[PDB]
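Q: Hi! Curious about what alpha-l-arabinofuranosidase looks like structurally. Here's the sequence.
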Amino acid sequence: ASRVVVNADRVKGTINRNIYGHFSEHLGRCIYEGLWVGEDSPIPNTNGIRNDVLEALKQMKIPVLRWPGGCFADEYHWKDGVGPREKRKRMVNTHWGGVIENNHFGTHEFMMLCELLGCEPYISGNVGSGTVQEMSEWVEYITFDGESPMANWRRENGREKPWRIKYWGVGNENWGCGGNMRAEYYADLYRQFQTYLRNYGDNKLHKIACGANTADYHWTEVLMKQAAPFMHGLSLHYYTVPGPWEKKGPATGFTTDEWWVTLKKALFMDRLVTKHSAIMDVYDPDKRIDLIVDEWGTWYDVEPGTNPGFLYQQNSIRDALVAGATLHIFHRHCDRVRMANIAQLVNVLQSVILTEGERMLLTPTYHVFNMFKVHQDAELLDTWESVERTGPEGELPKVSVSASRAADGKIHISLCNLDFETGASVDIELRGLNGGVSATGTTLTSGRIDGHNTFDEPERVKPAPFRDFKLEGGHLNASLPPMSVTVLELTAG
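A: Let's find out. The predicted structure is below.
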């Protein structure tokens, strides 16, 4: 059996709720259909935003939402998305391309969306093809409470008081689709652009520089050395891609080898975060600057017959394990990692929700985020572990565990069983308690390694009560089901 000691009297730090963040680009059906249906749609909606998705996201407690993209963000000109909705600029592609952009979802609709969800807005400004004045005016338009062309324009468009916004990305993927820049060159632009993004009134900007793709450590070094004093966060992007880029592999009907490879590549996040943080420590030993993993998740070949440019893929129990295992990695690094944004809220990459017209489903990834919401802003508890191995040559840990205490005093222990073939025995020793506790549990598992939900069968994979454990005198012995994510809630008394 795997062994775990939880020291409940020993706090290691706070798991920032923004670790549970999300990301929605104007791509495929993420914004259009996925969220924005329009005020006059037969799909029930609140001010143009579909109610089914809204309610599901609120239950999940989405903490922050990044918009309007990765690549799209450094092509976007924000002024195209404000003003009388029916008169905004429109781009239509008469090709398989499928680029229909009417700009009906713009700045006002996005701030409204965040207010509806109860989440923080995180806007990504355009460095690659934008100008310093353009970005500066966006911030002024949003946050200025005085009189000016930009602030007056906001009021004319229906928002009288300024909005608050903390999170502001100064360019996305600038090493690539955001301008193919050298780190050294981006650093100069970053420093210039951020200069003109002001704190108006009571607003305080949290400026986020574009960080490394995967293992580009030189990027991190240059950005930290050249630009650390001018930023509050630095990002990092890492997608879990089973096969080569040219043939990533399918979301369902995959082999057992693809299972192990996917999970092994997911766990590589720990090395990336560790090594990028080590470079950050050299220039910022006090850890002032946030590490922000604002693109992560699985990336497969699209579902057969669909437009590859739309990035639509299914979502299985394998993705649930990627999500749960990666979230645990962020927890362990919560002294530096303070936000993450899984790539793509709806209908795009590793989504929590898929839709098909009026129909929608919750993916197994959704269920992980909903179950793990108990970790948002929780205190991470000191845990020691000795876990068995699984997979070819024991290349994976069989189990991944994390323990935290919520503000109301309840303790939550989440556990992933990475082995699809057998259950996992975990012996959990609870120390530093002071009293006694009782426990309940919930588990997400499947009978098939590619177990997933569809529109006709939307509840094939979903959480269920978990009762296969024994709690006796400060020892919790659990028998986790195969391929599962489980959460145990412990209540004092």
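A: A fun detail: The CA atoms of residues 243 and 249 lie 6 Å apart.
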